[PDB]
Amino acid sequence: SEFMYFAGAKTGIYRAQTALISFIKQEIIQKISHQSWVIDLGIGKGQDLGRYLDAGVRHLVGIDKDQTALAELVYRKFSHATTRQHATNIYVLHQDLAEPAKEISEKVHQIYGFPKEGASSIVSNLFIHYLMKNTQQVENLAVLCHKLLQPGGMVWFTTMLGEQVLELLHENRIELNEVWEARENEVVKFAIKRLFKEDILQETGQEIGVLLPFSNGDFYNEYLVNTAFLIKIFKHHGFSLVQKQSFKDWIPEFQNFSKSLYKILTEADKTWTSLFGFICLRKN
Numbered sequence: 001s002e003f004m005y006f007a008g009a010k011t012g013i014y015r016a017q018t019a020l021i022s023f024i025k026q027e028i029i030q031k032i033s034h035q036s037w038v039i040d041l042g043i044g045k046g047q048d049l050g051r052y053l054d055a056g057v058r059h060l061v062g063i064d065k066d067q068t069a070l071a072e073l074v075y076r077k078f079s080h081a082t083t084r085q086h087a088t089n090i091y092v093l094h095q096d097l098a099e100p101a102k103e104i105s106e107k108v109h110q111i112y113g114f115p116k117e118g119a120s121s122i123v124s125n126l127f128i129h130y131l132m133k134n135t136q137q138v139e140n141l142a143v144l145c146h147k148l149l150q151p152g153g154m155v156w157f158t159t160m161l162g163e164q165v166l167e168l169l170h171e172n173r174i175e176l177n178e179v180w181e182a183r184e185n186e187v188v189k190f191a192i193k194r195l196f197k198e199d200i201l202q203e204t205g206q207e208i209g210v211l212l213p214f215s216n217g218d219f220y221n222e223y224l225v226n227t228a229f230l231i232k233i234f235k236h237h238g239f240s241l242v243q244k245q246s247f248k249d250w251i252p253e254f255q256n257f258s259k260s261l262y263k264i265l266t267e268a269d270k271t272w273t274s275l276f277g278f279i280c281l282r283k284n
């Protein structure tokens with residue numbers, strides 16, 4: 001009897017760049033070590049689960065809408081055994097995070113043991129763009145974060161930066177349905193398809209297509225995150241900006257965490273990384 005699985009042959013040109021992203025998420029998640037209640041908005045397949053465990057978070061609440069992803073998080077938890085401090089409890093909530101923030105806050109608060117006052121941190125990595133659809137969706141996101149947090153709680157966001165993408169497209173003179181491409185030794189490494197007519201950054205609703213790597217030109221559409229607009233809506237809802245910084249700024253520390261991968265990062269890697277950034281906000 002035999003079972004065989006053949007993946008497409010895939011080169012390693014994304015080695016160093018994806019190790020940089022992992023290092024960044026780890027340094028961010030390390031900052032909330034041993035907190036009692038941490039909520040993750042858009043937790044997916046649990047890619048950050050190893051990080052949350054290494055940080056000793058005590059109660060992780062992970063919310064996502066994709067039952068398939070969440071099952072992979074369950075398999076990941078139960079395969080792969082752990083025993084390091086003191087053990088994190090995990091609560092997975094299957095929920096569409098575009099629904100009214102009041103309902104989502106009620107379901108979360110009904111999780112056995114969730115604090116009436118609220119959690120200590122909200123983490124969301126590469127998710128908030130799904131909610132940049134229109135003004136109501138951004139307000140909903142800020143009201144949901146306000147309801148789930150205790151005062152002084154913090155929001156730890158990670159996102160593609162819409163200002164930088166628009167600036168990137170303009171400097172390369174990319175018009176409506178055209179594509180910016182990275183290219184390395186004659187292969188398209190990264191790419192962005194412009195899908196907005198406007199030449200000025202809109203609050204909400206501007207789409208681009210990002211190339212999915214190792215596909216044969218499959219582009220997946222996302223909205224642009226206007227971080228100015230995001231931070232401004234969060235300000236209207238009781239949050240102060242704490243920190244806002246490009247992923248490119250972790251590259252020097254990265255040299256101390258694997259000198260090897262540091263030296264292999266290419267100029268296309270650095271340009272792609274520059275499009276992503278961290279944003280910390282605190283509830284007043």
Ligand SMILES: C[S@@+](CC[C@H](N)C(=O)[O-])C[C@H]1O[C@@H](n2cnc3c(N)ncnc32)[C@H](O)[C@@H]1O
Nearest residue numbers: 042043044047064065066096097098125126130
């Ligand atoms: C880029 S992924 C991965 C997020 C994860 N924290 C990570 O860094 O890998 C974004 C996740 O957002 C989830 N998502 C997209 N739209 C959503 C919605 N309306 N409600 C809840 N989750 C959503 C997807 O299921 C996906 O797992």
